[PDB]
Amino acid sequence: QFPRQCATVEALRSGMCCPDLSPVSGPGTDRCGSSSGRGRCEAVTADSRPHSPQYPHDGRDDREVWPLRFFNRTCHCNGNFSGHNCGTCRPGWRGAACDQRVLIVRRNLLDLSKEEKNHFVRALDMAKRTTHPLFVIATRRSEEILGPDGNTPQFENISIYNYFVWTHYYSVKKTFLGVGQESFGEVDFSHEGPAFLTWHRYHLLRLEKDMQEMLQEPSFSLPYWNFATGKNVCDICTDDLMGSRSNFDSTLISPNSVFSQWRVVCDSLEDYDTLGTLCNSTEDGPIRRNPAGNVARPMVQRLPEPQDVAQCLEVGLFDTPPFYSNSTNSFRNTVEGFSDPTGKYDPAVSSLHNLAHLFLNGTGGQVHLSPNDPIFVLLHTFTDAVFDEWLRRYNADISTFPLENAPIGHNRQYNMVPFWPPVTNTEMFVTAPDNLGYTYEIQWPS
Ligand SMILES: *[C@@H]1O[C@H](CO[C@@H]2O[C@@H](C)[C@@H](O)[C@@H](O)[C@@H]2O)[C@@H](O[C@@H]2O[C@H](CO)[C@@H](O)[C@H](O)[C@H]2NC(C)=O)[C@H](O)[C@H]1NC(C)=O
Ligand SMILES: *[C@@H]1O[C@H](CO)[C@@H](O[C@@H]2O[C@H](CO)[C@@H](O)[C@H](O)[C@H]2NC(C)=O)[C@H](O)[C@H]1NC(C)=O
Ligand SMILES: *[C@@H]1O[C@H](CO)[C@@H](O[C@@H]2O[C@H](CO)[C@@H](O)[C@H](O)[C@H]2NC(C)=O)[C@H](O)[C@H]1NC(C)=O
Ligand SMILES: *[C@@H]1O[C@H](CO)[C@@H](O)[C@H](O)[C@H]1NC(C)=O
Ligand SMILES: NC(=S)Nc1ccccc1
Ligand SMILES: [Zn+2]
């Protein structure tokens, strides 16, 4: 989760993650690009408001009051500079002075040309294989972060796409209470709460940015999958996109797609939740996918209908008490899928986003693995498109996004876990075309 220059013995002991940009008087002389006007090292702002009583384990989990259990000093970048050491630009800006505006367009995957489809599939496959140039992931919790001898930081390199999988896993993992004890599972820093939409928004933004530099294509953008067609089948599960069903194993991906070659990370819950370790960069089995195949559960055998999307966009309040998976008339809870498209809660309901996940009946529909299936990317750009249309329609009204008593991780000023540098839900609660440098080529049913 941290820049590789902060994943050292020195940086962790200091509590400071303020790396140099280009120092030309020695180390520590250009922290946060302070010798240019680009930024400065300063104290971390973290949320201290109370959370819901559902989490009773304050003091036990490194994700609490993120990121204070690892660092209390961060770079704050000046103006429209951005990045861990202020060496890049805020979303929507480019240039050495971050003063040239950019606006990329996220399009329906099915509307792209034959060349554009092939370029997207190989970019994803490239990101699955290419080491992340900036971030390394911890394989142990903080008390064991410096290794057995106390001088070996327990971080591993990880590919650009597996880092995308890993941050999601880390945001949903159970609180480890100790060997012999049962891990606590009624906690989720990115789902079942107001932060669901802003968390996944930043999640996509980080991956899109990483792939832009990996490809050195500033205009590269992530497409979306319109899953609200009411269809019986996954219309993007073809061998020119995301892969069709294997004729030799109906739960595997066609060998004529590169995605049949992918191997998943974070599939050892037995180990993590009993020995206290974290998901590491070692890959395991293949992606399992079986669209419409959950015969035991007929309600998740068909995708949402077009009118489901139109109805959830009529929900005018972003979220409602108790800001959880049982909220009624909450746009966030409706599009997440715990309530029906009108906002009516029913514990037996699976709609929209949750239904699209369960429709896959496989890796993409399992809470600890879902980003391993690259359909996750397209499922959530569409979910983000619905969010962006809501932001336009209701003038980005953040007033119902609670400042306190949300599920832990979901207060408005919580730093979304485990993103670095620290970024709050508020910073994502903005209309994308004017504030984040992207827009959706899409039209809404009516
Ligand atoms: C800011 O952080 C430093 C470094 O402490 C680390 O910060 C966290 C990652 C946490 O996990 C601590 O255990 C780390 O040691 C703080 O300075 C240290 O504070 C500890 C106890 O809090 C003390 O035993 C050490 O001697 C201190 N070492 C140094 C070099 O200062 C510092 O207090 C923090 N400042 C705050 C929180 O305002
Ligand atoms: C990375 O994670 C894997 C999965 O947890 C670790 O492999 C497991 O290790 C446990 C205990 O050492 C064994 O009992 C399991 O049989 C292993 N599973 C597999 C699939 O190998 C692996 O050791 C971890 N790597 C590091 C460096 O910690
Ligand atoms: C995919 O769907 C199948 C159902 O078609 C699930 O398998 C069933 O799981 C339930 C609950 O564990 C069992 O009671 C049934 O006996 C299973 N049926 C069969 C035919 O296996 C499976 O769990 C789903 N997998 C995922 C990842 O969603
Ligand atoms: C990550 O890869 C780098 C090369 O970029 C290599 O020096 C080292 O093995 C890895 N570093 C860490 C901290 O794991
Ligand atoms: N299964 C996945 S990936 N998400 C989810 C979570 C809760 C309820 C329905 C779906
Ligand atoms: Zn500042």
Ligand SMILES: [Zn+2]
């Ligand atoms: Zn998610």
Ligand SMILES: [Zn+2]
């Ligand atoms: Zn999801």
